[PDB]
Design a binder for these strands. Sequence first.
DNA 1: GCATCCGTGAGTCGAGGAAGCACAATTTAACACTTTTGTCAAG
DNA 2: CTTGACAAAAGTGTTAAATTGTGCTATACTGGGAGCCGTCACGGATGC
Lengths: 177, 315, 93, 52, 1113
Amino acid sequence: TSVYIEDVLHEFSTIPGVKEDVVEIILNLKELVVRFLNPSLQTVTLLLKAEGPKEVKARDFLPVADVEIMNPDLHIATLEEGGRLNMEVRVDRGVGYVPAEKHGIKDRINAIPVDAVFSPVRRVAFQVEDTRLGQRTDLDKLTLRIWTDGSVTPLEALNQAVEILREHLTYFSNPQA
Amino acid sequence: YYITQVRKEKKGAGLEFATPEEALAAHERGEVALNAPIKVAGRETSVGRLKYVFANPDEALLAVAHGIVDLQDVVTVRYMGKRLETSPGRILFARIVAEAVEDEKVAWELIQLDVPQEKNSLKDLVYQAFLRLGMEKTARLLDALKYYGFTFSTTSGITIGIDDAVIPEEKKQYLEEADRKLLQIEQAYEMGFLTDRERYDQILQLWTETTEKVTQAVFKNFEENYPFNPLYVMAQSGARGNPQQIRQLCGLRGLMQKPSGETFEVPVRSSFREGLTVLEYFISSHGARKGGADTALRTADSGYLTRKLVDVTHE
Amino acid sequence: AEPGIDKLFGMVDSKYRLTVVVAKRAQQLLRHGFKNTVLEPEERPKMQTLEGLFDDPNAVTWAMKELLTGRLVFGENLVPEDRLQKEMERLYP
Amino acid sequence: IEIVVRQMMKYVEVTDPGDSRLLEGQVLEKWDVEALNERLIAEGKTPVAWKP
Amino acid sequence: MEIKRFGRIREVIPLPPLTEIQVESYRRALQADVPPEKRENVGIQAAFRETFPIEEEGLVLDFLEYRLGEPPFPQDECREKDLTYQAPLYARLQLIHKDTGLIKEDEVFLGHIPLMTEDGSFIINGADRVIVSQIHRSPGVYFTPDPARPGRYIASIIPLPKRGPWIDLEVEPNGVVSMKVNKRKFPLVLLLRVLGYDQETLARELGAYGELVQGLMDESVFAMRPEEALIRLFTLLRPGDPPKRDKAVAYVYGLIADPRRYDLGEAGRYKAEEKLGIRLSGRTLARFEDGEFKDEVFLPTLRYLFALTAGVPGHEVDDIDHLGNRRIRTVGELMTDQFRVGLARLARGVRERMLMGSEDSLTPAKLVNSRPLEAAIREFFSRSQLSQFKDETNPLSSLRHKRRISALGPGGLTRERAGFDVRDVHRTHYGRICPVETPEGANIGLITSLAAYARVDELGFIRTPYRRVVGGVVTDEVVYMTATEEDRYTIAQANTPLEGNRIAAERVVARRKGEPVIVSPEEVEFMDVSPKQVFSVNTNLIPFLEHDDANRALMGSNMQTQAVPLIRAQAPVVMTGLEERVVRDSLAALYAEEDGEVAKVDGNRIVVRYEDGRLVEYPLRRFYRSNQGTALDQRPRVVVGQRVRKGDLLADGPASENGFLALGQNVLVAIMPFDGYNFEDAIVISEELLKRDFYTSIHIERYEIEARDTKLGPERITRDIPHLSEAALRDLDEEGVVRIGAEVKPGDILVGRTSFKGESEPTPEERLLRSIFGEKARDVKDTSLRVPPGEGGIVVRTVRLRRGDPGVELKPGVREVVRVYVAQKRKLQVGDKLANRHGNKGVVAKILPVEDMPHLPDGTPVDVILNPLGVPSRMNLGQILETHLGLAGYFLGQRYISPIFDGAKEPEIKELLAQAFEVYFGKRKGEGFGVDKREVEVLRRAEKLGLVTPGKTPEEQLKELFLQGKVVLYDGRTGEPIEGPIVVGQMFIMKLYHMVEDKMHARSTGPYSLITQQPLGGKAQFGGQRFGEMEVWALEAYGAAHTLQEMLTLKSDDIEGRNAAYEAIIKGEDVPEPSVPESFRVLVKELQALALDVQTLDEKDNPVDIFEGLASK
DNA sequence: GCATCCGTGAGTCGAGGAAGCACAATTTAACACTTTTGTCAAG
DNA sequence: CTTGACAAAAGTGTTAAATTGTGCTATACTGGGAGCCGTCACGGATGC
Ligand SMILES: [Mg+2]
Ligand SMILES: [Mg+2]
């Protein structure tokens, strides 16, 4: 949701010794997959301190309690000799797609809000086959295919989806004139 | 237009029977299609009209929901005390108008049930509704027509592919004939039987006639083999395009005019589906620029004329 | 379309007379704070607000509804203009 | 079209002034000369002869 | 991602330097690197040699040589400091005293000449500019038919523009040949007699044609002496001046014989000799030598006119629009013309200064005042119609701008006086001017583009390459020839089949003087190099161009110049092959000079260790704002230690992906109606595009403010703005300027400025208010720079120029100037304009969530939905073909190059689609999935639609649909399939420069005009909307008298009415009755200024005063 | 009648913003002083 | 409401700069300079 880079004021800038500009780095961070192991955890700050030359991946973040990086090999930036990258990445929990213009979250003055795509589900497909039971031959076989980023398993997402649909069905009660 | 147009089958298309029991029985055997025209005893009907008789429009549209029949299938429905023989789509259209004006009796008099709803039929419906109901009910009918037209065009399955520009098999035959007649025109011209100007006129007439025949062959193919082809439906219903534009896509581009006004002897024998050559594309650009220049120089004249008319008649 | 536009158009010989009548009545309603309306309390136009239903502030809407009821008289040389305003001020201060 | 054409045919040319101050060949409006003629005839005076 | 290439035509030569029309023309004019003694008589060298020596008739000022110095400031500094990138020009001149015979030489500083940059543009007052090449009628001798009288011809002699009068030669019905000059007609016998022509000579020369010579043998003047004839002619040409031989000869010599006043030109002289079959010694109609006039071209011109009338086989009329008769004036020639104009003014002052003041003690520096020369040069580069604000929306925009040919401008046609003839595509345009790329509207046919392979020659004539064909075998010898030379040959087509190098076809399609014909291989003499040479660079970027109607291809090529660079731009899935050369030739990307090794890679610069050992550091242009506000930055594409060969890519520029032109994104498209949101060119897009930042662009706005010296006191840039809280000053630094990195919204302060209030007693109400609150009025007021409505973003840069800074030439009275740069990252939104390369354009009308979009059976949602109803009327089928190839490429993971008119065909596209189906459907089979129930329902409809063959299996029928580019598509809202198979594919779509963010404007009240008091116009001025005549008619036709009266008075210029109306509304009251508009009062006073008594009367004819008694004495 | 001349007309929004000096005459500025005005405490 | 000090707050009156207007140069000088140039309609007026 927000990234702070030391010595960086906005995202329309470059960093000495770093091959990518801030805009490219933020795009790389949008692909970071972070799994919270604690259901009551709402926010975290991941710290990265790197000196060139090296390929800074998502595995370079300092460890945090109850936080796991699901794609350690994600490439973040390329540091040249004499380049340094000290940044704090704030990871939040939520639903939907919240543009940076809406939440505008900044943990400090120079922090840069990032557009948030909270959905863990990547792709959903369902298949209907022509099954038969007994003498009835018009029966349906439903197969749901769910692709997730790994933070939430497909079974967990399916259970959460079923509960949401079940909860909404309870709204067709207590009718009013 | 999509829902109010009925299907036509060719599988049966002619078989005569003695009783409807035989006619339906053949249908289960696959010998006749649902909408293929047949003669049961003396009258000409189809399997759908005999097989599917609905007590009212709600039952007919319930069967459509269950996939029993399509909107374009011709069946028998009982509506307003009459045992109509139409498709569920046309019965659906009648209900659309009836509910918009909230008058079933007046609505039945405003529509033509036994035709697809093209631009002209829909224009007559709006005008008649205005005369009988007024602005308020007519504006409601226009809102209902817009809603259902948008809804049905999304799920109907209208799309344009390269294969949708169907090339008639008659185009090859016509072009070979034009080559022989053109070669025959050159033979006579070599023999002195006609001059340069009459040779020039005869060439233009030959390609003007071939273009007309190719246009007719293009549309005859659509209405016989691909009645639901996207280009045919758009032009027939009035939604988009005319026969001239369809011919260039599917038939031949035709004759092009020089900047001086003369027409090139050699026409563009290729359509847009096949792709023009470099020389054909350049030759075709002469008319494209001329049309663009005429349009630009025509707006000033029309605008000037309107100002003259306003200033003479403003009082 | 405006509610009852067909009926309103049929009440005048010229469509522009209807606009003049509606436009003049709207000015009368505004000038007296809607206290001179011929509309009953259950006929008054309403607008849905966050707090709740309130009287419609649009005076042109009020005039069209009043004109449909048939309790308004319009015409030329009904009464002298000066006397009309004087009486309406007295009846609805 | 007929409204515009009615404006095109709105004028006449005086051919015989009669008992008026109009000059032969003068171009004026058809309505004006017709009103002028009826006034002149009302007082027993020769009317203006005009040309469409 | 592998690239598959289509096509059979082998191009023997590569595209020439795309900007050489600009770069080479300007090099020849300046000749800055050629040694002064080796310089040829062209460019400004010819301008110097034509004006000098300047003789007083006994001081002579002679020009020896010139030189150009190094520019005072580099290009980057000029942009920052609003300077012009130029070089100082010095001329080495010598003053010689004819009396004494003494020579003094010194180098005089003539001024500054703007320098063309490497890409072919100029920096004028800090702004990038392009000089558009001008097309005009070539000088020479032309023979056109007389329209009034059939069978009669007129001979026209045309010099260089503004280099002599046009001469007309005609045979009158009387039989006398009349010469028309400066609108005055006279008999050519008189001028012919002046040139020392006798009766016998005209008989020998022009007497073999018929009676025409008999009409040119009037002996009334032949016996007259040439001196008397010159005096007689001088009287006719200018009646009234005292006829004197010295004045008479000077007039005739300066009219047709003075090289400094009449200039037929190098091209005009070449054309005249080619047509008349003569050899002109110079470039003037006649020569004056030995105190006598000598004919040069009048007799040869008359001889041709007579023989053309007589009917000799070898003479013919001229087509004036024939491209062998029309030439191009490039930047070099256009600049040299203004250099000669101002250099003649410099000579005029020299003559009028060397006849007055210290005649003996004169030096070249004292005589020469270069201000006239500089003024002429600066006028050309600043206020010329052909000097245009550079178009740099993307790299292609600037490349196109430099190849444009304009028929307008000083010395050209008028936008409203150009007929169909000048706007038509001439047959000689083939291979020289693009037939499709032109502005649709009032400028159609008046602005054109150079064709890809065309080059302008030394004389200004466009030439195109052709392959020499000998004995039926095509050779690799390429010949560049003009339209006049092209007319002599039978030229075959590039698509002519060849068996190696021999023409295989028995019947060959060719051209003869532009007429298509069918010939044999032995009748072919030249061949087209490739189909690309017929079209411009923009048009050559449209794949499947042969399937698109030219009217839409015009739109397709024009819209590519308006695409904005994107942070995630992609090269198209289907390319034509010119994408790499456009980036290479635009000089936006960075390439290796030779083999080397990358030593340092950074976001700011790249250091390369070349094989010779020298280190080169390339700074990268980062977040630079172009003329259009789009951000242009270079992103490194190499890593430290990587080995690079010569010409390898080092960093991408704007709108390029690995060196390929990337003007947009490749998206998944479904062609189908969608709930009326596709209506009438509207486009429906998925929210998934925004989530992954497709069609997101960076735009930069520049705000400027100045602190000036004033009578009341100097304006100050300060943080201490009166009557402002700390919230409004929160982001301002101690200097009073907004801090870098702050976000600014409309109404926020950018730079704080206070100005001294004018001395004016306050109103009593405000004077009591101040007394009540005990606040003393301050002497300064708030005049700071704020963010305009609808704008804002992030402050990225602030520039501060102060008086006395090196290179800062601020205007007098200006203490300093502050510039603030605000960047904003724009995402695709509703109202933004999208387009593809085939002329299909529309605005986003709906952004749908991912779960509402149609999706494939595998769960993949489409990105864009396009209405099929836009195709049939437009006839641009190239987009359908691109979509089909995109669908195959999507599943095979490859990209394609299909050259225009020689590329992918349906049989090859269908063989690719068959492979794509195996990966697309074979993957499903291995996963353990069969055919969906929903697909079976669709397959049942499809066979009723004649799309699939009855009796086949579902998989075979699904493949039959796939080879047609159609798939079974599900509805994301219902989960049910669309009742018919849909055309789904991958298409390249561009986000154009037209954004609703820049165009939405609203106003209640604001600034008004000075004289008419009506609202100003333009969003920049916060102006109102024009309610023109046609809008008034619409209100009149509606009968809305009161609506019309409000807009005429209360809302436009009723000063008392608009004041009362505003006060009434904010008090909750109805607006009052309007009054007389102020525009009518202005009209009455203007009619009175013409001495006309305009009076408004009442029903009884008494005057009514509309001025409130303010003008009644 | 007849040519030849001149004069008037040719779409709409938007976005682009080179004497020099002398001297006299007049005006502006800076003192000077007196003459209001505004406060003060009383009274 | 006064009643007398008070102090700027302003105005009136000279004076000197600073600005502005005006007249005057004595070898002999004696008629300008820049367009140059691709449209088509009409009336309407004159050359007769
Ligand atoms: Mg994620
Ligand atoms: Mg039955």
